[PDB]
């Protein structure tokens, strides 16, 4: 979902969460950057038997100290 800020992208988020119920979950930035095969990573644990995960608020990647996303 690409666009400028304050374009109502969260409106669809809040509509879909209410429409779906418990099957929708918001997940932070751990899964696309941080390693999940090493250490305790409940992020992959809670997604079991879920129908929708969301990920947002991704910051700048060119900033100093920002970890580049491993594919």
């Amino acid at each position: 979902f690409f666009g400028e800020t304050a374009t109502g992208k969260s409106t669809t988020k809040r509509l879909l969460k209410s429409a779906i119920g418990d099957l929708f979950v918001e997940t932070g930035q751990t899964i696309l950057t941080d390693v999940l095969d090493k250490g305790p990573n409940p992020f992959i644990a809670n997604m079991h038997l879920k129908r929708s995960v969301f990920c947002s608020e991704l910051p700048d990647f060119a900033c100093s100290g920002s970890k580049k996303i491993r594919s």
Partner: protein, 71 residues
């Protein structure tokens, strides 16, 4: 309609884009604020739309109000 004064500066309107030299931008921002302490945030701001349109010419699509408002 604000062509006249810009045409007095020798600039040429290409693709309805006002040619703002990068050096002039640095000069006008440094006239008001320090540039050494404001380098990181400024470069982060400009990296989003920075591109090499020419080998040595870089025009910015932002027009300062002080350059178009008569004193």
């Amino acid at each position: 309609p604000l062509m006249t004064d810009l045409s007095k500066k020798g600039y040429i309107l290409y693709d309805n884009v006002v040619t703002l030299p990068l050096t002039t931008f640095q000069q006008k921002i440094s006239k008001y604020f320090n540039s050494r302490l404001f380098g990181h945030d400024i470069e982060s701001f400009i990296n989003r739309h920075k591109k090499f349109a020419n080998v040595s010419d870089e025009y910015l699509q932002y027009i300062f109000i002080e350059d178009i408002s008569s004193p």
